[PDB]
Amino acid sequence: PYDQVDQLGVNTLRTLSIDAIQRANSGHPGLPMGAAPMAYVLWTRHLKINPKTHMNWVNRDRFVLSAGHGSALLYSLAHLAGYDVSMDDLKNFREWKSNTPGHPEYGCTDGVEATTGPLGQGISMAVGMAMAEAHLGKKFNREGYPVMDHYTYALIGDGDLMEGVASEAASLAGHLKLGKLIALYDSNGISLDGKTSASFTENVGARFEAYGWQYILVEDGFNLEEIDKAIVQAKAESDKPTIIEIKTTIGYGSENQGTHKVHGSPLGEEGVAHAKEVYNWNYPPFTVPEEVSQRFKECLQDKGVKAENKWNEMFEAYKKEYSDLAQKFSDGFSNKVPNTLGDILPQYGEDDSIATRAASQKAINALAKEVSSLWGGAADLASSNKTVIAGEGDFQPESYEGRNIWFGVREFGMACAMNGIMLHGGTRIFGSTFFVFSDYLKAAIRLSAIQKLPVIYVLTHDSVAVGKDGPTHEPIEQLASLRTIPNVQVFRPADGNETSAAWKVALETLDKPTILVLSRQNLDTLPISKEKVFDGVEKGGYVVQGAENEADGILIATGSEVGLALKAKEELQKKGKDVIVVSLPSWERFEAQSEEYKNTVIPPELKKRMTIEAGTTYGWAKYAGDHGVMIGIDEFGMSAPSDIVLRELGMSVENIVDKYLE
Amino acid sequence: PYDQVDQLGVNTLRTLSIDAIQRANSGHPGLPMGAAPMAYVLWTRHLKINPKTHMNWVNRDRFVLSAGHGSALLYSLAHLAGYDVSMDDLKNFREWKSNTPGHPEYGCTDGVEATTGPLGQGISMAVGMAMAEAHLGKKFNREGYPVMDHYTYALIGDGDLMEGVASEAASLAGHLKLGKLIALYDSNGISLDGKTSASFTENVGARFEAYGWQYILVEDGFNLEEIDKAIVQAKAESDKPTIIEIKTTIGYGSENQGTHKVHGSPLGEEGVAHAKEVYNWNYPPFTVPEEVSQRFKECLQDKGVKAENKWNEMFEAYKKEYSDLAQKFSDGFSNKVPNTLGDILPQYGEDDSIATRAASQKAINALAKEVSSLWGGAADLASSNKTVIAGEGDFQPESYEGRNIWFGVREFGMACAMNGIMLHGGTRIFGSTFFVFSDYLKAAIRLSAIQKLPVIYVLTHDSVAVGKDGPTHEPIEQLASLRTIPNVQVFRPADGNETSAAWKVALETLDKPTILVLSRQNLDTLPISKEKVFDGVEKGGYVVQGAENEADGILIATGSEVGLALKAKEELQKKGKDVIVVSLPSWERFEAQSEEYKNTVIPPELKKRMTIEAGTTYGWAKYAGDHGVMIGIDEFGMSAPSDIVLRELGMSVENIVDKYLE
């Protein structure tokens, strides 16, 4: 099974990682040193990948380093395995423009499946990848045609297991019985500040068992043979996901091994030498020994090529027997969308009154028949958010084809799962909760943005118009929270047509997440054509009603406040004041337009402006100008009837009119 | 033990709650109906409180309804118990300005210990309350003087237990062996969307046991006697916190009992009648029966008065035997602070170079001797944040007097615990993590703000200057995230004197949380006096260097960018341009100043302005104006040496100078 060359492999990982860190004079040597043994066994015997085709083989096993600080080990693996990470790349760890950055960045480095610096999120994404494999397998697989059949692995440490979000992900994964998911827990009794037993002395195996996982202990984590065995039993147990606790010694080889001092700093030239002693390692820095290159070739590369070719062959047969199906399987992965979205989506007449959450629910159902790769759910708020895909089944172990995911009351875990689902490929995902609770998943939105994933977030109950549930349930600052996240687009639709148009844009946008911000209360339909609303929303902002002749002023608004501005336009047309009304459903989309376009919507030279949005005024001075007035809410709300809360916080016609006139 | 009158009590809670909800035509009747039995047993036999003194008795048992949607039960209890919640108040549930709002609001209603609409946070705050009781008891208690000796209870449901943050809190509570903490779990198999088994089928008892809690099952949750017994065993087990799982039927009495339909909506007049049938209840709406009033008086009120008086008597003896101690015990609760803070805190000379995280560490240690009620810790980042209180001990079961809390990698649980610590009273708490991970605890900051708690958040590693760790670890949008939260103050100190001044302000501010945003890299000391910096920081913004005569322009900056602006002032004084330099360490504090003061710092009439901050430009147009230029970063950062990242994202002198001149 395992012989002496293999140990020289383990130690090649150790040394590369440590040399990389030492040359950068920056990085985290402890995990590489304690976890090379486990990573070696996995990558050489148990990872079904083919580096020769980079990350394009859709049925490769997926590996995630959730303990993202172990990056130097991941790169050393990617290099040994044959990905486009060269020795020179390892020598540029943490250097400007390198493909070997401080924490792993998906899209930056060949072989890196996920961006994982932030703790907890790596494993919770892996859970999403595993849900996707299960979903797709059940939808597409057939007698003799295992088209979506693979494992999901996550390497995790104590930090991951302390984070709430990894609890939410593990509970959800246990309930969904994701038997193809396996976690390798590098259990070394050390976190950054010191002994883990200063804060974390819980029984991890038992918790995991309480979730419906399988727990396996490997007491000797430098025993390659035992790790292999544990992974084999993890695989045989396909009714349950499995966590393998692997007892290791952090910083193995340093005088400081087993202490916090090896967690987050280079060893220094002395400590690198001392570890090389203990390893009986005599090679110069940044050398791979020949027998190690050859063992990886043997174990990993050649096996990978043959499994991909046997999958390509099996696949060509699939596509001939089950033609229409395999075409959908391909369209899933390539994100094909129909040209008729504009016709498929619901349209609203000038008399319609509908809440944007309900108009979103109607888009979802109209879309589900035509975009067959679309699935999603709510964080135990499908009935409140309105995010049931009617008659399309529930995603459960006995029905992995069901398209309605029941995330439970797990906002952050939901978001991270959606990231994994999208890293996996093959579907379009959406997830809903209340906008005020976007604070709970904000760090995952951040990761959607970094990783450029077109996750769709459906955030309902968007303002103090929520009413009786009171301040904790009434958003104020959450638009500012999400608009500021780079590489996102936030749409706050003003009626049902804007809401349909926002969903179309969300389907057509493939390199950033789209966030839809939706009302609880009914809103009137804007008095202009479908054609113009769709154009305007595709552009992020547009004129809803111009001035007959020369404009006295301009009202710029979003969401539910656009109807308010339309009313204030009427009241003001009396008093002798003819104002423009602009809807600005997305700041980000609006600013990506030409200066020419933007000038047509907000006249650079017109200076009597009012901005109106039920949320903080922070940021609005940009459109309001030195001379403008900002109507907004910069205080917590209250528990009262909707109309009273709005009136009292100044989201009224009378207030907008008075403020424009004073 | 329990007799027929008691059951009529249980049913008074049920009916009041349901009438309250029905009249409001808004609210959540399911939990009240299924959990009155448990709440009755607790409040009448096991809650050591005295309503006659409201919430002023510092050693009362603390009760938290974590399932905040059960508010109508909480108010019915507060009313029956004798708090200032009248029958008329119950008739104004969810009505404007009522003291009976939709979800419970601390500070709004007599008898309400915590604001708990957002799920997970109620129990995690309770954990903090329990840590405070343990801390204070160990510090102050003596032979025959149990001055801080009481229980902490939390009533929780399935939603709480799905949330990550309640896992972080339960793990931490298990590790700290908080034996005075008891949770009552209303386990009814139902969440909002449907059966809990659609998403949540884990073994809660076993997880809780894996944390180091005691688990007790009460299979018949309408058996008053069994609940009582379980609470008695929970109390006898003082080595471990205890969760009591109480199997109930949600909406008991409705045709719809045991379904999701009773979770979040009124029953309707029909269903209220049908529940009253099942209860054999013949009274008119909003009636308390006489024997019930008398049983509460008997069980709860009179016992409460005698326990408080016996504590007052025991206390007067304490204060005479242990005088200096009991004076500190009182100063703790009243938030007394010395007048010499300004002298105690570290001061920096014009040559000093220090990172604001390190200057904060020095303030912490200088403060700890003089403010004896100050304790705190880090989310497994004490060594990175710099939040070790030197030589003041660790907070652990064998040393509950230790003042350094090891929260582990539990940002959100840390924050919520700090809220509970502050609701409890008796200390000043601070907690640290990396600023980029404030996203993880943002919902708890929100609750500090709502509840007006002067929690201190120490957020380090504030910008892309972090460098090699790369984008996931480099804040961009997080200042916008926190500045927009109503009722907070965010300070981004520009040197060590501003950092000392910010800590003083944080101690003196008692009605909102203070957030300190701190640098990783060293910053130079600002070239002006201690006196002027302290004045300026107390004011939120101020002039650092004026123009010799007439100003050509103004540079307004924060944090580390103030030193940059000072350099650009030198380079610009050449080219014939004399500019003002303003430091704006806190927007919120600055805007609370008079218009007169603000005009002296930022001249209303001067229009050549540049704002400079290493983070998003969103919001800055307010100070920059129509004609100004905003220097900021609106993209994710990169993994590279600190100085290169700053240069490339334009946080340089050369860029500020060119931009001011073009």
PDB file of all heavy atoms in Angstrom, chain A residues 24 94 163-164 168 171 202-203 210 411 446 468-469 477, chain B residues 24 94 163-164 168 171 202-203 210 411 446 468-469 477:
ATOM      1  N   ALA A  24       8.718  34.165   1.344  1.00  0.00           N
ATOM      2  CA  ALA A  24       7.756  35.293   1.354  1.00  0.00           C
ATOM      3  C   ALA A  24       7.908  36.093   2.655  1.00  0.00           C
ATOM      4  O   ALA A  24       7.505  37.282   2.773  1.00  0.00           O
ATOM      5  CB  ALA A  24       6.362  34.761   1.231  1.00  0.00           C
ATOM      6  N   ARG A  94       2.645  35.146  -2.136  1.00  0.00           N
ATOM      7  CA  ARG A  94       2.269  36.406  -1.508  1.00  0.00           C
ATOM      8  C   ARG A  94       2.850  37.630  -2.174  1.00  0.00           C
ATOM      9  O   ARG A  94       2.736  38.750  -1.615  1.00  0.00           O
ATOM     10  CB  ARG A  94       2.581  36.366   0.005  1.00  0.00           C
ATOM     11  CG  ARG A  94       1.732  35.301   0.714  1.00  0.00           C
ATOM     12  CD  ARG A  94       2.011  35.110   2.224  1.00  0.00           C
ATOM     13  NE  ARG A  94       0.815  34.533   2.835  1.00  0.00           N
ATOM     14  CZ  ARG A  94      -0.038  35.162   3.680  1.00  0.00           C
ATOM     15  NH1 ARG A  94       0.220  36.368   4.127  1.00  0.00           N
ATOM     16  NH2 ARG A  94      -1.158  34.549   4.099  1.00  0.00           N
ATOM     17  N   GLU A 163     -17.126  28.149  13.981  1.00  0.00           N
ATOM     18  CA  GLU A 163     -17.995  29.131  13.350  1.00  0.00           C
ATOM     19  C   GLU A 163     -19.405  28.626  13.233  1.00  0.00           C
ATOM     20  O   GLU A 163     -19.625  27.561  12.703  1.00  0.00           O
ATOM     21  CB  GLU A 163     -17.456  29.501  11.982  1.00  0.00           C
ATOM     22  CG  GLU A 163     -16.259  30.430  12.049  1.00  0.00           C
ATOM     23  CD  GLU A 163     -16.564  31.892  12.453  1.00  0.00           C
ATOM     24  OE1 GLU A 163     -17.770  32.257  12.582  1.00  0.00           O
ATOM     25  OE2 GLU A 163     -15.567  32.692  12.578  1.00  0.00           O
ATOM     26  N   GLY A 164     -20.369  29.449  13.640  1.00  0.00           N
ATOM     27  CA  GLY A 164     -21.785  29.162  13.456  1.00  0.00           C
ATOM     28  C   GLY A 164     -22.160  28.644  12.066  1.00  0.00           C
ATOM     29  O   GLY A 164     -22.998  27.752  11.928  1.00  0.00           O
ATOM     30  N   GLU A 168     -24.529  25.410  10.841  1.00  0.00           N
ATOM     31  CA  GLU A 168     -25.689  25.444   9.950  1.00  0.00           C
ATOM     32  C   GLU A 168     -25.445  24.515   8.731  1.00  0.00           C
ATOM     33  O   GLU A 168     -26.292  23.746   8.361  1.00  0.00           O
ATOM     34  CB  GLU A 168     -25.973  26.883   9.494  1.00  0.00           C
ATOM     35  CG  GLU A 168     -26.257  27.915  10.584  1.00  0.00           C
ATOM     36  CD  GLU A 168     -26.491  29.314  10.013  1.00  0.00           C
ATOM     37  OE1 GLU A 168     -26.583  29.435   8.774  1.00  0.00           O
ATOM     38  OE2 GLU A 168     -26.524  30.312  10.801  1.00  0.00           O
ATOM     39  N   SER A 171     -25.477  20.708   9.750  1.00  0.00           N
ATOM     40  CA  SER A 171     -26.833  20.229  10.107  1.00  0.00           C
ATOM     41  C   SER A 171     -27.606  19.995   8.830  1.00  0.00           C
ATOM     42  O   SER A 171     -28.315  19.002   8.640  1.00  0.00           O
ATOM     43  CB  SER A 171     -27.500  21.233  11.130  1.00  0.00           C
ATOM     44  OG  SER A 171     -28.905  21.205  11.163  1.00  0.00           O
ATOM     45  N   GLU A 202     -15.450  21.051  23.280  1.00  0.00           N
ATOM     46  CA  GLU A 202     -16.630  20.259  22.966  1.00  0.00           C
ATOM     47  C   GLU A 202     -16.295  18.895  22.292  1.00  0.00           C
ATOM     48  O   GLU A 202     -15.206  18.680  21.760  1.00  0.00           O
ATOM     49  CB  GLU A 202     -17.550  21.036  22.008  1.00  0.00           C
ATOM     50  CG  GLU A 202     -16.949  21.340  20.625  1.00  0.00           C
ATOM     51  CD  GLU A 202     -17.981  21.920  19.650  1.00  0.00           C
ATOM     52  OE1 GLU A 202     -18.523  23.010  19.931  1.00  0.00           O
ATOM     53  OE2 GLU A 202     -18.271  21.287  18.619  1.00  0.00           O
ATOM     54  N   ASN A 203     -17.274  18.017  22.261  1.00  0.00           N
ATOM     55  CA  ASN A 203     -17.066  16.736  21.609  1.00  0.00           C
ATOM     56  C   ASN A 203     -17.552  16.781  20.190  1.00  0.00           C
ATOM     57  O   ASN A 203     -18.758  16.552  19.899  1.00  0.00           O
ATOM     58  CB  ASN A 203     -17.747  15.586  22.367  1.00  0.00           C
ATOM     59  CG  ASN A 203     -17.426  14.209  21.769  1.00  0.00           C
ATOM     60  OD1 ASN A 203     -17.113  14.073  20.599  1.00  0.00           O
ATOM     61  ND2 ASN A 203     -17.498  13.198  22.595  1.00  0.00           N
ATOM     62  N   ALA A 210     -24.619  13.681  16.086  1.00  0.00           N
ATOM     63  CA  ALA A 210     -25.973  14.201  16.374  1.00  0.00           C
ATOM     64  C   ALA A 210     -26.599  14.857  15.124  1.00  0.00           C
ATOM     65  O   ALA A 210     -27.844  14.908  14.963  1.00  0.00           O
ATOM     66  CB  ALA A 210     -25.888  15.195  17.535  1.00  0.00           C
ATOM     67  N   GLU A 411     -29.589  31.547   7.364  1.00  0.00           N
ATOM     68  CA  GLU A 411     -29.287  32.508   6.334  1.00  0.00           C
ATOM     69  C   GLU A 411     -27.862  32.372   5.811  1.00  0.00           C
ATOM     70  O   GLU A 411     -27.629  32.347   4.617  1.00  0.00           O
ATOM     71  CB  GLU A 411     -29.470  33.931   6.870  1.00  0.00           C
ATOM     72  CG  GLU A 411     -30.894  34.240   7.164  1.00  0.00           C
ATOM     73  CD  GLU A 411     -31.393  33.781   8.535  1.00  0.00           C
ATOM     74  OE1 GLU A 411     -30.647  33.202   9.402  1.00  0.00           O
ATOM     75  OE2 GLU A 411     -32.551  34.113   8.743  1.00  0.00           O
ATOM     76  N   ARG A 446     -20.329  38.800   0.229  1.00  0.00           N
ATOM     77  CA  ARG A 446     -19.049  39.256  -0.085  1.00  0.00           C
ATOM     78  C   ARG A 446     -18.298  38.206  -0.917  1.00  0.00           C
ATOM     79  O   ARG A 446     -17.631  38.557  -1.921  1.00  0.00           O
ATOM     80  CB  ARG A 446     -18.312  39.714   1.163  1.00  0.00           C
ATOM     81  CG  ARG A 446     -17.021  40.466   0.904  1.00  0.00           C
ATOM     82  CD  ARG A 446     -16.328  40.975   2.172  1.00  0.00           C
ATOM     83  NE  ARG A 446     -15.576  42.195   1.852  1.00  0.00           N
ATOM     84  CZ  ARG A 446     -14.234  42.287   1.763  1.00  0.00           C
ATOM     85  NH1 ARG A 446     -13.446  41.242   1.950  1.00  0.00           N
ATOM     86  NH2 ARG A 446     -13.674  43.442   1.459  1.00  0.00           N
ATOM     87  N   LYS A 468     -45.860  46.195  11.830  1.00  0.00           N
ATOM     88  CA  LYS A 468     -46.198  45.804  13.202  1.00  0.00           C
ATOM     89  C   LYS A 468     -45.105  45.011  13.877  1.00  0.00           C
ATOM     90  O   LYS A 468     -44.987  45.077  15.136  1.00  0.00           O
ATOM     91  CB  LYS A 468     -47.543  45.081  13.280  1.00  0.00           C
ATOM     92  CG  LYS A 468     -48.677  46.098  13.119  1.00  0.00           C
ATOM     93  CD  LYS A 468     -50.062  45.472  13.031  1.00  0.00           C
ATOM     94  CE  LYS A 468     -51.172  46.525  13.093  1.00  0.00           C
ATOM     95  NZ  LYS A 468     -52.492  45.901  13.381  1.00  0.00           N
ATOM     96  N   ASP A 469     -44.285  44.313  13.048  1.00  0.00           N
ATOM     97  CA  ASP A 469     -43.206  43.474  13.571  1.00  0.00           C
ATOM     98  C   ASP A 469     -42.130  44.314  14.220  1.00  0.00           C
ATOM     99  O   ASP A 469     -41.373  43.826  15.082  1.00  0.00           O
ATOM    100  CB  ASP A 469     -42.602  42.573  12.513  1.00  0.00           C
ATOM    101  CG  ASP A 469     -43.398  41.261  12.284  1.00  0.00           C
ATOM    102  OD1 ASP A 469     -44.353  40.873  13.033  1.00  0.00           O
ATOM    103  OD2 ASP A 469     -43.029  40.579  11.308  1.00  0.00           O
ATOM    104  N   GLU A 477     -30.397  50.428   7.169  1.00  0.00           N
ATOM    105  CA  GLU A 477     -29.093  50.612   6.673  1.00  0.00           C
ATOM    106  C   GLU A 477     -28.671  49.554   5.696  1.00  0.00           C
ATOM    107  O   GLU A 477     -27.451  49.517   5.288  1.00  0.00           O
ATOM    108  CB  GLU A 477     -28.135  50.596   7.837  1.00  0.00           C
ATOM    109  CG  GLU A 477     -27.999  49.238   8.524  1.00  0.00           C
ATOM    110  CD  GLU A 477     -29.009  48.998   9.658  1.00  0.00           C
ATOM    111  OE1 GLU A 477     -30.215  49.339   9.498  1.00  0.00           O
ATOM    112  OE2 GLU A 477     -28.661  48.350  10.666  1.00  0.00           O
TER     113      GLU A 477
ATOM    114  N   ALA B  24     -55.324  42.824  17.599  1.00  0.00           N
ATOM    115  CA  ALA B  24     -54.322  43.533  16.768  1.00  0.00           C
ATOM    116  C   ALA B  24     -54.465  43.105  15.302  1.00  0.00           C
ATOM    117  O   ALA B  24     -54.021  43.796  14.345  1.00  0.00           O
ATOM    118  CB  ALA B  24     -52.947  43.219  17.269  1.00  0.00           C
ATOM    119  N   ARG B  94     -49.163  45.845  19.292  1.00  0.00           N
ATOM    120  CA  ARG B  94     -48.752  46.204  17.942  1.00  0.00           C
ATOM    121  C   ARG B  94     -49.277  47.538  17.467  1.00  0.00           C
ATOM    122  O   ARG B  94     -49.130  47.865  16.261  1.00  0.00           O
ATOM    123  CB  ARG B  94     -49.090  45.064  16.956  1.00  0.00           C
ATOM    124  CG  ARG B  94     -48.292  43.795  17.289  1.00  0.00           C
ATOM    125  CD  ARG B  94     -48.603  42.554  16.417  1.00  0.00           C
ATOM    126  NE  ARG B  94     -47.438  41.671  16.458  1.00  0.00           N
ATOM    127  CZ  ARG B  94     -46.577  41.431  15.439  1.00  0.00           C
ATOM    128  NH1 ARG B  94     -46.798  41.912  14.240  1.00  0.00           N
ATOM    129  NH2 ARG B  94     -45.487  40.669  15.634  1.00  0.00           N
ATOM    130  N   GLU B 163     -29.928  28.462  14.056  1.00  0.00           N
ATOM    131  CA  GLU B 163     -29.013  29.555  13.762  1.00  0.00           C
ATOM    132  C   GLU B 163     -27.621  29.254  14.238  1.00  0.00           C
ATOM    133  O   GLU B 163     -27.431  28.929  15.388  1.00  0.00           O
ATOM    134  CB  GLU B 163     -29.516  30.839  14.391  1.00  0.00           C
ATOM    135  CG  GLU B 163     -30.679  31.453  13.636  1.00  0.00           C
ATOM    136  CD  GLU B 163     -30.327  32.116  12.282  1.00  0.00           C
ATOM    137  OE1 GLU B 163     -29.111  32.220  11.945  1.00  0.00           O
ATOM    138  OE2 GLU B 163     -31.296  32.594  11.588  1.00  0.00           O
ATOM    139  N   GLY B 164     -26.634  29.465  13.370  1.00  0.00           N
ATOM    140  CA  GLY B 164     -25.227  29.358  13.730  1.00  0.00           C
ATOM    141  C   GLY B 164     -24.848  30.033  15.049  1.00  0.00           C
ATOM    142  O   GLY B 164     -24.042  29.509  15.819  1.00  0.00           O
ATOM    143  N   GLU B 168     -22.579  28.700  18.313  1.00  0.00           N
ATOM    144  CA  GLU B 168     -21.405  29.343  18.901  1.00  0.00           C
ATOM    145  C   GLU B 168     -21.662  29.639  20.402  1.00  0.00           C
ATOM    146  O   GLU B 168     -20.839  29.371  21.235  1.00  0.00           O
ATOM    147  CB  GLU B 168     -21.061  30.632  18.140  1.00  0.00           C
ATOM    148  CG  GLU B 168     -20.758  30.499  16.648  1.00  0.00           C
ATOM    149  CD  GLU B 168     -20.463  31.849  15.993  1.00  0.00           C
ATOM    150  OE1 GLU B 168     -20.347  32.848  16.732  1.00  0.00           O
ATOM    151  OE2 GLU B 168     -20.406  31.927  14.724  1.00  0.00           O
ATOM    152  N   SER B 171     -21.787  26.341  22.555  1.00  0.00           N
ATOM    153  CA  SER B 171     -20.455  25.706  22.695  1.00  0.00           C
ATOM    154  C   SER B 171     -19.670  26.472  23.735  1.00  0.00           C
ATOM    155  O   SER B 171     -18.995  25.924  24.612  1.00  0.00           O
ATOM    156  CB  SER B 171     -19.769  25.590  21.276  1.00  0.00           C
ATOM    157  OG  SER B 171     -18.367  25.495  21.297  1.00  0.00           O
ATOM    158  N   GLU B 202     -32.014  16.870  13.098  1.00  0.00           N
ATOM    159  CA  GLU B 202     -30.859  16.532  13.917  1.00  0.00           C
ATOM    160  C   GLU B 202     -31.233  16.135  15.377  1.00  0.00           C
ATOM    161  O   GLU B 202     -32.320  16.427  15.874  1.00  0.00           O
ATOM    162  CB  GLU B 202     -29.896  17.729  13.993  1.00  0.00           C
ATOM    163  CG  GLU B 202     -30.462  18.983  14.681  1.00  0.00           C
ATOM    164  CD  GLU B 202     -29.395  20.057  14.918  1.00  0.00           C
ATOM    165  OE1 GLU B 202     -28.817  20.556  13.928  1.00  0.00           O
ATOM    166  OE2 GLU B 202     -29.110  20.391  16.082  1.00  0.00           O
ATOM    167  N   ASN B 203     -30.287  15.537  16.066  1.00  0.00           N
ATOM    168  CA  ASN B 203     -30.531  15.175  17.452  1.00  0.00           C
ATOM    169  C   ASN B 203     -30.020  16.243  18.374  1.00  0.00           C
ATOM    170  O   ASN B 203     -28.818  16.263  18.758  1.00  0.00           O
ATOM    171  CB  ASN B 203     -29.904  13.818  17.812  1.00  0.00           C
ATOM    172  CG  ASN B 203     -30.265  13.357  19.230  1.00  0.00           C
ATOM    173  OD1 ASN B 203     -30.564  14.148  20.108  1.00  0.00           O
ATOM    174  ND2 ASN B 203     -30.244  12.065  19.433  1.00  0.00           N
ATOM    175  N   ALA B 210     -23.004  16.970  23.537  1.00  0.00           N
ATOM    176  CA  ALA B 210     -21.637  17.053  22.980  1.00  0.00           C
ATOM    177  C   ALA B 210     -20.967  18.397  23.337  1.00  0.00           C
ATOM    178  O   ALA B 210     -19.719  18.506  23.427  1.00  0.00           O
ATOM    179  CB  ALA B 210     -21.705  16.855  21.463  1.00  0.00           C
ATOM    180  N   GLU B 411     -17.242  35.196  16.152  1.00  0.00           N
ATOM    181  CA  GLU B 411     -17.492  36.615  16.120  1.00  0.00           C
ATOM    182  C   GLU B 411     -18.912  36.966  16.547  1.00  0.00           C
ATOM    183  O   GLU B 411     -19.126  37.845  17.359  1.00  0.00           O
ATOM    184  CB  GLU B 411     -17.266  37.158  14.706  1.00  0.00           C
ATOM    185  CG  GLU B 411     -15.837  37.094  14.303  1.00  0.00           C
ATOM    186  CD  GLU B 411     -15.377  35.749  13.736  1.00  0.00           C
ATOM    187  OE1 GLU B 411     -16.158  34.745  13.576  1.00  0.00           O
ATOM    188  OE2 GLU B 411     -14.211  35.774  13.370  1.00  0.00           O
ATOM    189  N   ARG B 446     -26.113  45.682  15.370  1.00  0.00           N
ATOM    190  CA  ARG B 446     -27.370  46.267  15.219  1.00  0.00           C
ATOM    191  C   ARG B 446     -28.145  46.213  16.544  1.00  0.00           C
ATOM    192  O   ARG B 446     -28.782  47.219  16.943  1.00  0.00           O
ATOM    193  CB  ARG B 446     -28.110  45.671  14.033  1.00  0.00           C
ATOM    194  CG  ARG B 446     -29.368  46.413  13.625  1.00  0.00           C
ATOM    195  CD  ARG B 446     -30.063  45.835  12.388  1.00  0.00           C
ATOM    196  NE  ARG B 446     -30.765  46.914  11.682  1.00  0.00           N
ATOM    197  CZ  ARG B 446     -32.100  47.091  11.651  1.00  0.00           C
ATOM    198  NH1 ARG B 446     -32.929  46.283  12.290  1.00  0.00           N
ATOM    199  NH2 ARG B 446     -32.612  48.108  10.986  1.00  0.00           N
ATOM    200  N   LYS B 468      -0.522  41.050   2.536  1.00  0.00           N
ATOM    201  CA  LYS B 468      -0.220  39.757   1.916  1.00  0.00           C
ATOM    202  C   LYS B 468      -1.353  38.765   2.037  1.00  0.00           C
ATOM    203  O   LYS B 468      -1.488  37.877   1.145  1.00  0.00           O
ATOM    204  CB  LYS B 468       1.096  39.167   2.423  1.00  0.00           C
ATOM    205  CG  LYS B 468       2.270  39.924   1.793  1.00  0.00           C
ATOM    206  CD  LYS B 468       3.632  39.520   2.340  1.00  0.00           C
ATOM    207  CE  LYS B 468       4.778  40.136   1.534  1.00  0.00           C
ATOM    208  NZ  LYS B 468       6.069  39.457   1.827  1.00  0.00           N
ATOM    209  N   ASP B 469      -2.184  38.946   3.097  1.00  0.00           N
ATOM    210  CA  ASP B 469      -3.301  38.037   3.354  1.00  0.00           C
ATOM    211  C   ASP B 469      -4.356  38.154   2.278  1.00  0.00           C
ATOM    212  O   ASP B 469      -5.145  37.214   2.053  1.00  0.00           O
ATOM    213  CB  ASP B 469      -3.921  38.245   4.721  1.00  0.00           C
ATOM    214  CG  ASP B 469      -3.169  37.511   5.863  1.00  0.00           C
ATOM    215  OD1 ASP B 469      -2.241  36.660   5.667  1.00  0.00           O
ATOM    216  OD2 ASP B 469      -3.547  37.796   7.016  1.00  0.00           O
ATOM    217  N   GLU B 477     -15.741  47.908   2.248  1.00  0.00           N
ATOM    218  CA  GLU B 477     -17.028  48.447   2.421  1.00  0.00           C
ATOM    219  C   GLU B 477     -17.473  48.484   3.853  1.00  0.00           C
ATOM    220  O   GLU B 477     -18.687  48.808   4.133  1.00  0.00           O
ATOM    221  CB  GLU B 477     -18.005  47.606   1.639  1.00  0.00           C
ATOM    222  CG  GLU B 477     -18.203  46.193   2.188  1.00  0.00           C
ATOM    223  CD  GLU B 477     -17.220  45.153   1.626  1.00  0.00           C
ATOM    224  OE1 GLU B 477     -16.000  45.455   1.499  1.00  0.00           O
ATOM    225  OE2 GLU B 477     -17.608  43.984   1.429  1.00  0.00           O
TER     226      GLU B 477
END
